[PDB]
Amino acid sequence: ARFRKVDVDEYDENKFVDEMTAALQAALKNPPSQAVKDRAGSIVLKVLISFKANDIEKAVQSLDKNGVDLLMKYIYKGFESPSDNSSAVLLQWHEKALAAGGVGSIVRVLTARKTV
Amino acid sequence: GRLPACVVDCGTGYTKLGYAGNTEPQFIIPSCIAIKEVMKGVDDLDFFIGDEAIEKPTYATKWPIRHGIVEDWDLMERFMEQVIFKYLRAEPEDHYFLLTEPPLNTPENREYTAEIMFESFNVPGLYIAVQAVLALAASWTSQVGERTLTGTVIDSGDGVTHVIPVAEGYVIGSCIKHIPIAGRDITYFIQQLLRDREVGIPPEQSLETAKAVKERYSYVCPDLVKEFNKYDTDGSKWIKQYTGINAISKKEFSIDVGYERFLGPEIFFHPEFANPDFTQPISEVVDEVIQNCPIDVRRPLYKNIVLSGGSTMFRDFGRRLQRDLKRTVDARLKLSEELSKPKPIDVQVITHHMQRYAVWFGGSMLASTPEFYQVCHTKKDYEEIGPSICRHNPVFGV
Amino acid sequence: MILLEVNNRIIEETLALKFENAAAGNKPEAVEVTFADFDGVLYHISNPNGDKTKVMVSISLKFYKELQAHGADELLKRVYGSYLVNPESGYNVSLLYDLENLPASKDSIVHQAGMLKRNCFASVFEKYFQFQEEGKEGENRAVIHYRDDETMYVESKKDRVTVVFSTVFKDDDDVVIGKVFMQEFKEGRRASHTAPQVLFSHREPPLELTDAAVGDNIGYITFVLFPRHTNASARDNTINLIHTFRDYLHYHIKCSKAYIHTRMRAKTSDFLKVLNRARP
Amino acid sequence: TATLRPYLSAVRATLQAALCLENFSSQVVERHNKPEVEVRSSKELLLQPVTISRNEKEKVLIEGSINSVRVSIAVKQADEIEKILCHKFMRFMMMRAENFFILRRKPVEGYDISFLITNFHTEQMYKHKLVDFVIHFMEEIDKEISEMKLSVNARARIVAEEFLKNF
Amino acid sequence: TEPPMIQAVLTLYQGLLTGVVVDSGDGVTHICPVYEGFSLPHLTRRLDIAGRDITRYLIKLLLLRGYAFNHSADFETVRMIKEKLCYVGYNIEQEQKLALETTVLVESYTLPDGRIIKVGGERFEAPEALFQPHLINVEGVGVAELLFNTIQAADIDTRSEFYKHIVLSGGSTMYPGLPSRLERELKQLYLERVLKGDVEKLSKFKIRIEDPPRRKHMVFLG
Amino acid sequence: PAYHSSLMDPDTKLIGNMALLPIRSQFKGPAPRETKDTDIVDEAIYYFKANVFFKNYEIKNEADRTLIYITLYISECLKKLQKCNSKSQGEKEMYTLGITNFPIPGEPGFPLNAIYAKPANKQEDEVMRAYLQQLRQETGLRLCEKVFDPQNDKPSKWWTCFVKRQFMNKSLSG
Amino acid sequence: AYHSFLVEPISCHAWNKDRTQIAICPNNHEVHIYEKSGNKWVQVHELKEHNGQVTGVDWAPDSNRIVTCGTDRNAYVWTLKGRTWKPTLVILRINRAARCVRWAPNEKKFAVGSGSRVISICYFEQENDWWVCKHIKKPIRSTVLSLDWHPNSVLLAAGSCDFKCRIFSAYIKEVEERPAPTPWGSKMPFGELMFESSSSCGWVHGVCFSANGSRVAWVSHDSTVCLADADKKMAVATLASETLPLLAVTFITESSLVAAGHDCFPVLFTYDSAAGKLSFGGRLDVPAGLDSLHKNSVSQISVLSGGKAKCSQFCTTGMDGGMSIWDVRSLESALKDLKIV
Numbered sequence A: 001a002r003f004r005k006v007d008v009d010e011y012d013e014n015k016f017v018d019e020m021t022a023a024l025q026a027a028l029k030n031p032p033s034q035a036v037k038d039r040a041g042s043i044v045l046k047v048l049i050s051f052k053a054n055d056i057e058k059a060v061q062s063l064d065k066n067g068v069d070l071l072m073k074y075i076y077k078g079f080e081s082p083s084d085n086s087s088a089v090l091l092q093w094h095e096k097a098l099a100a101g102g103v104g105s106i107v108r109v110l111t112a113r114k115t116v
Numbered sequence B: 001g002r003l004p005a006c007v008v009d010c011g012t013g014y015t016k017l018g019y020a021g022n023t024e025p026q027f028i029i030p031s032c033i034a035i036k037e038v039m040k041g042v043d044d045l046d047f048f049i050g051d052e053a054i055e056k057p058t059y060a061t062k063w064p065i066r067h068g069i070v071e072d073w074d075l076m077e078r079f080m081e082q083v084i085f086k087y088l089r090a091e092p093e094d095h096y097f098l099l100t101e102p103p104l105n106t107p108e109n110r111e112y113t114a115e116i117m118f119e120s121f122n123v124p125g126l127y128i129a130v131q132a133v134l135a136l137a138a139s140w141t142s143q144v145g146e147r148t149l150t151g152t153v154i155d156s157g158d159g160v161t162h163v164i165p166v167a168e169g170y171v172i173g174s175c176i177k178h179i180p181i182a183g184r185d186i187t188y189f190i191q192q193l194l195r196d197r198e199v200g201i202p203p204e205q206s207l208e209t210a211k212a213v214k215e216r217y218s219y220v221c222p223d224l225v226k227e228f229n230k231y232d233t234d235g236s237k238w239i240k241q242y243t244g245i246n247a248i249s250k251k252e253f254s255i256d257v258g259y260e261r262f263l264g265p266e267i268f269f270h271p272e273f274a275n276p277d278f279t280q281p282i283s284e285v286v287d288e289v290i291q292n293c294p295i296d297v298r299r300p301l302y303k304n305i306v307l308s309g310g311s312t313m314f315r316d317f318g319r320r321l322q323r324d325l326k327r328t329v330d331a332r333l334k335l336s337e338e339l340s341k342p343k344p345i346d347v348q349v350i351t352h353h354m355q356r357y358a359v360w361f362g363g364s365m366l367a368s369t370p371e372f373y374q375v376c377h378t379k380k381d382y383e384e385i386g387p388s389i390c391r392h393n394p395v396f397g398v
Numbered sequence C: 001m002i003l004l005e006v007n008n009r010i011i012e013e014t015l016a017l018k019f020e021n022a023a024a025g026n027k028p029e030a031v032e033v034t035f036a037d038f039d040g041v042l043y044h045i046s047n048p049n050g051d052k053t054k055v056m057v058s059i060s061l062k063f064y065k066e067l068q069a070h071g072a073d074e075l076l077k078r079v080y081g082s083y084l085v086n087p088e089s090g091y092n093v094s095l096l097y098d099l100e101n102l103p104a105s106k107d108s109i110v111h112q113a114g115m116l117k118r119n120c121f122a123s124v125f126e127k128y129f130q131f132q133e134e135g136k137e138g139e140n141r142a143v144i145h146y147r148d149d150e151t152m153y154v155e156s157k158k159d160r161v162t163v164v165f166s167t168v169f170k171d172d173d174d175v176v177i178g179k180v181f182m183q184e185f186k187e188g189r190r191a192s193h194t195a196p197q198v199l200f201s202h203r204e205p206p207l208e209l210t211d212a213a214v215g216d217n218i219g220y221i222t223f224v225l226f227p228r229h230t231n232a233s234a235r236d237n238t239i240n241l242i243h244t245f246r247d248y249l250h251y252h253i254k255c256s257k258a259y260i261h262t263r264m265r266a267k268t269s270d271f272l273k274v275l276n277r278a279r280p
Numbered sequence D: 001t002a003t004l005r006p007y008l009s010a011v012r013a014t015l016q017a018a019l020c021l022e023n024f025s026s027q028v029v030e031r032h033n034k035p036e037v038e039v040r041s042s043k044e045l046l047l048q049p050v051t052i053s054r055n056e057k058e059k060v061l062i063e064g065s066i067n068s069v070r071v072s073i074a075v076k077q078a079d080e081i082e083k084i085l086c087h088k089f090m091r092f093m094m095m096r097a098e099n100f101f102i103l104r105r106k107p108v109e110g111y112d113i114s115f116l117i118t119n120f121h122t123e124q125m126y127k128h129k130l131v132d133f134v135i136h137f138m139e140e141i142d143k144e145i146s147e148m149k150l151s152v153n154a155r156a157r158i159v160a161e162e163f164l165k166n167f
Numbered sequence E: 001t002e003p004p005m006i007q008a009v010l011t012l013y014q015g016l017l018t019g020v021v022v023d024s025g026d027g028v029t030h031i032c033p034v035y036e037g038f039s040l041p042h043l044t045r046r047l048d049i050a051g052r053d054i055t056r057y058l059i060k061l062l063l064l065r066g067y068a069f070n071h072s073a074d075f076e077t078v079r080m081i082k083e084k085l086c087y088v089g090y091n092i093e094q095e096q097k098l099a100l101e102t103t104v105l106v107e108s109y110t111l112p113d114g115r116i117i118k119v120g121g122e123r124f125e126a127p128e129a130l131f132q133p134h135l136i137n138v139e140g141v142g143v144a145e146l147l148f149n150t151i152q153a154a155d156i157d158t159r160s161e162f163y164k165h166i167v168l169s170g171g172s173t174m175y176p177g178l179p180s181r182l183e184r185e186l187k188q189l190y191l192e193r194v195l196k197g198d199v200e201k202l203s204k205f206k207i208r209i210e211d212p213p214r215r216k217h218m219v220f221l222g
Numbered sequence F: 001p002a003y004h005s006s007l008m009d010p011d012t013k014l015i016g017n018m019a020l021l022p023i024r025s026q027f028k029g030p031a032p033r034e035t036k037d038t039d040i041v042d043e044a045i046y047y048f049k050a051n052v053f054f055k056n057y058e059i060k061n062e063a064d065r066t067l068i069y070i071t072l073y074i075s076e077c078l079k080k081l082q083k084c085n086s087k088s089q090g091e092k093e094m095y096t097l098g099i100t101n102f103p104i105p106g107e108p109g110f111p112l113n114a115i116y117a118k119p120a121n122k123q124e125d126e127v128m129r130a131y132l133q134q135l136r137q138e139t140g141l142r143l144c145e146k147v148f149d150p151q152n153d154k155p156s157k158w159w160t161c162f163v164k165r166q167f168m169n170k171s172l173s174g
Numbered sequence G: 001a002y003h004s005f006l007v008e009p010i011s012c013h014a015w016n017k018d019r020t021q022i023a024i025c026p027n028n029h030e031v032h033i034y035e036k037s038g039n040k041w042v043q044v045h046e047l048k049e050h051n052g053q054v055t056g057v058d059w060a061p062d063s064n065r066i067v068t069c070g071t072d073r074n075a076y077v078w079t080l081k082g083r084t085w086k087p088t089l090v091i092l093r094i095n096r097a098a099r100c101v102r103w104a105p106n107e108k109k110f111a112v113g114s115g116s117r118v119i120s121i122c123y124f125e126q127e128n129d130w131w132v133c134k135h136i137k138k139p140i141r142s143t144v145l146s147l148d149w150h151p152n153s154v155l156l157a158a159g160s161c162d163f164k165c166r167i168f169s170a171y172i173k174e175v176e177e178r179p180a181p182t183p184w185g186s187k188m189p190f191g192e193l194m195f196e197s198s199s200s201c202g203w204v205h206g207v208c209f210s211a212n213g214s215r216v217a218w219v220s221h222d223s224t225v226c227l228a229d230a231d232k233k234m235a236v237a238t239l240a241s242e243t244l245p246l247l248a249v250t251f252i253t254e255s256s257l258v259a260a261g262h263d264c265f266p267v268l269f270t271y272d273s274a275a276g277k278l279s280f281g282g283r284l285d286v287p288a289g290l291d292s293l294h295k296n297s298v299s300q301i302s303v304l305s306g307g308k309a310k311c312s313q314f315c316t317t318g319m320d321g322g323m324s325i326w327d328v329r330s331l332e333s334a335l336k337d338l339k340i341v
């Protein structure tokens, strides 16, 4: 019954195959190896953490919807690397990035096949 | 091991507890717990169980078990605390436990029981035996040379009597039948009979009197008229006296005990005497249950009708059941021979000594055997496979 | 029920019923009972040689030789006197009550019988309570292995007697709950300064202890008893409490877990009402 | 308790986005219908996993798919007593998983408890109400683990003092 | 009306003249190859495991789950349960993870006496007997392996067509997912025992196990 | 089960659909001459205490209807003897009750009309009436020897106790 | 105007020619046909034949034939004979569930999208008097979720889980003949791929052709709506929503789209051919515990009368088991700041 141990499905030919405010706008530019991706998210993570609790709503509202979507993909990424108040602040970035992009910006985080 | 297993049989009204190997329970107490009635501090511990919990001036009596099944788990769990730590004085981590379950207890209830025993008391081993099988095992003590776990158990406590077919140690659930007549019904009946004839019996003790009379004087007769006759003819030989004491008077009260003696247990056979919604004689229900079981197992069921319950204690009860059933069954084969020669069916009703605590006795015997330790769920398996293992409990002992 | 009872209900109730029937002039029934007690104790009540007029109560402690080296036999003789007979095979102490020769009041003998276990324990304590009361120091410590994997250490000193219990928690989580309890004993004197001082060492034994085991599930409780507890007035009570401690502690760890359960049943029940209120 | 309100809010919004399901018959097995987030035998049907962390310890993992979502929570456990009470409480519920139709019998590796919400749940129940339940759940388990912690100490003191006073 | 040892040909007659008819009823399972109109007597084998064996095996499983069913008194009731809740797992390892880690498989069934039971993992475990006879103490290889051999045994020039013309027959093959499991099984064998392990030709092996949508009264329609 | 009458001969006469059985009696009536030493009234007073408890009764022969009738009547008697204070009093109180005109088959007031045929004409009507009263008198007499203990003023509680129990839940007064 | 047929999802629906009867699938293997009596709804028909849930229903208006497809892999064509509906089995030749079905405008064909990653174009051969079908396979990689025909009954738009919206040709010279050219192309042999969107994310939940079929729009799971304009070199306009994914969409004019989904309410979308841009026209449903008519996701939206050219009423059915009827003019009143084309 060893034959039954090989995932014949892996070779099935039907398996799907994919084909400070200035500082923010600055970091959100040209987004993408998890190395180049992480290097990218770190520069943006670096800028978000370096914000005041009152200078967020002003930077968030100065971005076009596509920008906000990008910011949200980065905010979620931030969540995967806690350390210090970075999470208490990120949750503020989430609050603002959400009021601007709507729950739909989160939907596009989940839907992205090629993400940051 | 050097320490004997713990054996607990929890009934709706009474719990039988003691150590495996013994002939009778070390304690037979009321399945009740008295509590104070937000829980804070060590309030949960303020309670009493059994007799000590029936008339507690400042506590409410509760019955965690309805129709032989646990309803209130919070309360059943505490009850256990005292069963173990106050009465048995057993270190729970050192004894295997054998508990019992009525038929039709769900697999979920077994896991709840298991959760309590392993996660609260840390028992090393657990086995949940089905009451009917233990009863069949208690009867091997009797009239029986070759032991089997196939027979018809007739369990009758204070609630509702059960006619349970057992084949090879496994209850045939789909054929069980219940009878709306049991201990409580008999008492209520005896009570009326007394109210109608006797006087002096304190209303606040109407039941207590009845129950006292049912347990100390009642019995099954073979024929009503003849018994009625006897009492009216030679009243001297059959009318018994019963004295008691008033509660708020202490003045001793006397009353005569008569017909209720044999009339009380008679409602098993003639339910219509007390129940307006049920009329089948017990001997007919048993006959009907067995007929519904697989044919190839019917004769075995007829040869091995075993009793269990304080309500099957009545003298000659089993003798009256056999006669009645022997007829109901012979009569039937009398017609099948006219509309045409089946071998006569052997109907036998076993009766033994440990009948009030039949189930506990069977659990005590089975729990004091090596095989008992082989078929118990260990604490290791519980924690490595999960409480699901306690759903099934291998029959054993043949 | 907070404190564990010291007496044994099966012994007391068995003797009681037999003595009652004896007094009533009834014919003797046969009795044959095997039961246990905390700490691996095993008892046997029977009619020696089938003589139903004789009821024997025997106790078996795997660690009896140990208690015997500290005055057990002498103490037991003082308490039971002529009721004490040669020990039944498989047991260390046997009491024999002649149904045909019972005292006027059965109360004391029944009460004393029920305390068989506690009495087998008492000597090691009276012994060391005495050492202190006579300032006799330098006396070797008594080592009692009350369970297969647990030990108690009695030792007298100038102005105090110390009792150290080495207990084991089979449940890893029971250690954590045990610590919460030990913590409160550790501070027990805050509400009773005259009370014994309790100490607790979680994994390692107090310095005072040797071949003492070391493990994540072991725990060392120390009780520092003072004259007010060890003198001839407190003595018995002190002994009644101190010898049931280890079981007192585990009994409460287990009841806590039961209490937690009633909480979890209520919280889960609430959660299920909500979920279902989400159904159209 | 400052960072709490912001944490749940972010979690709730992510739950809103994720709980957008529909019935989906298996593309792999004739006449079968399984939760894609569990079987994962068709990559295109799985959404990008996401996380909402409150700090280095507390976080929620949300894994969506065309027809089901798996939500795992890392519960706050300050000391050992909260740790064992939490572990115990999550086990109590997982054992009763069948009455909790959305509960997972085992947590996702790394978390304390997990939910499996299928399209069938979002149909039998109002999804926004399901989104409230998860948030409600997170809040209520914490309060419960706290009450339990106090209950333990409460009884401990009474038990310690009931024994010591008697000497 | 000709049960093997010819209905198999009747069935096939669907519109095909050459194919393999895996028919499984209550008492027996057969694999009946059929070529250009006739059934090659040789090549036609029997599998000692069918519907009664699964209906029985379920009873055992439901026992372990905490439900006590009498093999005689309740055989009919469990068969009705089987028919309604059972199915063939595609990938057992993955089916077991669902049963062990989730509850999506649990389903309720009301028994004749009103009692309600719950069935989960036993819904795919009972039919697994067909693939692993050793589960019901039966020696053999299981309907899948048998089929593979039965074809790899017949002429070379006829195997190609056969593999792409397997057709389920009998009530005991109505299990949801059965066709897929078989197709996955044959592919595993072909991979191991024919392509020797060249997981680069597996895509050229065409299998087509059909579950007749027009099927209640085929024998006749045939 | 319940107790049936065994006084049903092949040559037994029928008054209505009840059985016209013999009865040792100094009372006037169409009752045939006593054949043996135990009449229908004896079977009623005998099987009474065991029958009164039943709710269902399978009618087998017309003798059962006569039995059932007398049984129900005993119930009526006890409700009278109960309030008495002497055998003599009872003896007198019974005569009056027997002379009372209770409803008969077909009449509203007679329970069990769905089982007891109605007299088919004025003649059978007068006979049946006479018979029933005859039975009522004899039964009320004998029953009187029983209820009262050799210590007069003592209606035996062993008969009085049944006063509230109705055979087949039926009554001639209800 | 809302009406609850049940509390379980209405899987799909279809209305007859005069919008006098509606066919729904109440989360079953069945199809219930309701008709109104006065102002009450009454069930007049129950079509039972599928062995799995029905996922799609379409009603050919003139020939008055109901076509259904289910997870049981089958498709039945129902014909009303006297007072009962008799099904005729149609083998789609697939081994997975059927996910959607639509009759071609000419009623000579019907298409079924499925989990076998293909589309089954079905027609009837009077010759052998039964139904047959050809498959459109390439380049579909996943389950086909929705279909919609072009007015010429040849071009077919499809939305699948491979995150694509495509337009194919289901040209069957055996039931129709040479299609006239179209801005989508001149070569329309069977299966030809005429257009394929360029997204990499979001399953395409719904697709729709405009009245004149020169515009194709679709809604995806990434909460965006799109429209490819064939008169502008197939350029694609895109609009990202701030809310949840749309599950169903339709044109109500040549430049107006209405859609509904997980938000539970219909929304308006307008297209500007000049800028080649799409704009959010607002919520059309203005006032469990929701302020919306439907209590769960809306999964189907259809034009009840007025056509896709100038719709005057549309119907929506959702997972809440309700069916709503929206009056375009009424909506244009409750909201004065509305803009329709």
Ligand SMILES: Nc1ncnc2c1ncn2[C@@H]1O[C@H](COP(=O)(O)OP(=O)(O)NP(=O)(O)O)[C@@H](O)[C@H]1O
Pocket: B010, B011, B012, B013, B014, B015, B067, B068, B156, B157, B158, B159, B160, B182, B183, B184, B211, B214, B215, B216, B308, B309, B310, B311, B312, B313, B314, B356
């Ligand atoms: N000697 C006796 N004669 C008649 N009845 C008795 C006697 N002794 C006890 N009983 C009755 O036995 C009944 C209780 O039996 P028991 O088996 O303990 O019930 P349970 O098991 O507690 N109830 P259940 O769960 O239904 O079995 C009560 O009605 C008692 O009155």
Ligand SMILES: Nc1ncnc2c1ncn2[C@@H]1O[C@H](COP(=O)(O)OP(=O)(O)NP(=O)(O)O)[C@@H](O)[C@H]1O
Pocket: E024, E025, E026, E027, E028, E050, E051, E052, E055, E079, E082, E083, E084, E170, E171, E172, E173, E174, E175
């Ligand atoms: N839907 C179903 N799913 C699973 N098993 C089924 C189903 N329907 C029937 N069966 C089983 O298939 C067997 C019956 O096969 P059936 O098609 O009736 O053949 P038959 O004419 O009875 N000859 P045979 O099956 O050999 O007895 C029994 O085990 C049924 O329980």
Ligand SMILES: [Ca+2]
Pocket: B010, B011, B012, B068, B131, B157, B359
């Ligand atoms: Ca019982």
Ligand SMILES: [Ca+2]
Pocket: E024, E025, E026, E170, E171
């Ligand atoms: Ca067959």
